[PDB]
Amino acid sequence: HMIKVLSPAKINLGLWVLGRLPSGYHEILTLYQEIPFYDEIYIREGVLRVETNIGIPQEENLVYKGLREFERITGIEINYSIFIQKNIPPGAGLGGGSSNLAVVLKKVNELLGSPLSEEELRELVGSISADAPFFLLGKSAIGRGKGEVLEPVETEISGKITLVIPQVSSSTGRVYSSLREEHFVTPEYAEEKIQRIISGEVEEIENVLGDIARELYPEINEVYRFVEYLGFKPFVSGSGSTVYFFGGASEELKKAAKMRGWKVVELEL
Ligand SMILES: C[C@](O)(CO)[C@H](O)COP(=O)(O)OP(=O)(O)OC[C@H]1O[C@@H](n2ccc(N)nc2=O)[C@H](O)[C@@H]1O
Ligand SMILES: Nc1ncnc2c1ncn2[C@@H]1O[C@H](COP(=O)(O)OP(=O)(O)O)[C@@H](O)[C@H]1O
Ligand SMILES: [Cl-]
């Protein structure tokens, strides 16, 4: 009895870093926005298996790690065969892996009689991925702490958004590790910025991890410069690699993308 579950992406509509935590993580503020861009996940009764169409090893898959932790916490044997069709590229700053982890573990929990509460599930996915708890909420939310302390919000943002995703995979850890004092801001500063974005002022979006990613991976900067040339203000999701803008894709951009190996995703919010 195979089922299909959709695993959506997010973008950050702005991100600010407040400082380092002794744990090695960073305290942040960000506006998360779930976007209609999905991995397709097929769940089948069978021997525990987690496969993708892009060669991610089972042992390194967040979903697999989550299911194995589920088994350990709960005592219940997981007999599900998982295949993920990965439309959302790894290292794109769209939280694809985090989404995968959250929707699979939410579904498997329900299928097995809900041995974990909303809170326990949240803590489980959260202990593996800072972005994963967002995907248990979806829609629009302010993420605080490491990103997992969530406040649902209603924004005045709608219309076309285009994602331009280069082939280069951005390492989240490497981008965060390049942060120094000059990159940090007070929460009061970030908090004012986020509220303006929520009210529709998209010009107020910024993201220091984007600044760093453009330096560490020159192709992200090329995409960024190309979007400017197209007549749009570019923005960066996560720690890169994705650049987005508020508008549609022209034939010129599609041509550039085809030639350069960029993925162009046209969305409506
Ligand atoms: C950049 C964002 O995509 C914005 O939504 C997220 O903060 C990244 O979250 P994620 O992909 O779930 O990241 P994780 O897999 O939990 O952590 C990967 C690495 O990123 C760094 N990291 C992540 C989250 C955070 N609040 N501070 C950090 O410093 C840590 O060095 C960590 O080892
Ligand atoms: N199910 C999964 N989907 C995508 N990436 C995964 C998955 N499981 C593990 N990974 C690993 O996580 C990294 C990218 O994950 P992703 O959530 O796309 O990062 P980000 O969105 O922060 O750029 C890659 O190194 C990849 O090998
Ligand atoms: Cl930005």
Residue numbers in the entry: 0 to 268
Reproduce passages from the article:
Similarly, CDPME2P was present in the crystallization conditions for the sample used to derive complex II, but only CDPME was observed. The lack of electron density for the terminal phosphate groups of CDPME2P and AMP-PNP is either a result of disorder and/or hydrolysis. His25 forms three hydrogen bonds to the pyrimidine. The cytosine position is also stabilized by hydrophobic contacts with the side chains of Tyr24 and Tyr175, the latter forming π–π stacking interactions with the cytidine. The erythritol moiety of CDPME protrudes into a cavity in which catalytic residues Lys9 and Asp130 are placed. ADP binds in a cavity formed by the N-terminal domain adjacent to the CDPME-binding site.
The enzyme displays the characteristic α/β galacto-homoserine-mevalonate-phosphomevalonate kinase fold, with the catalytic centre positioned in a deep cleft between the ATP- and CDPME-binding domains. Gel filtration and analytical ultracentrifugation indicate that AaIspE is a monomer in solution.
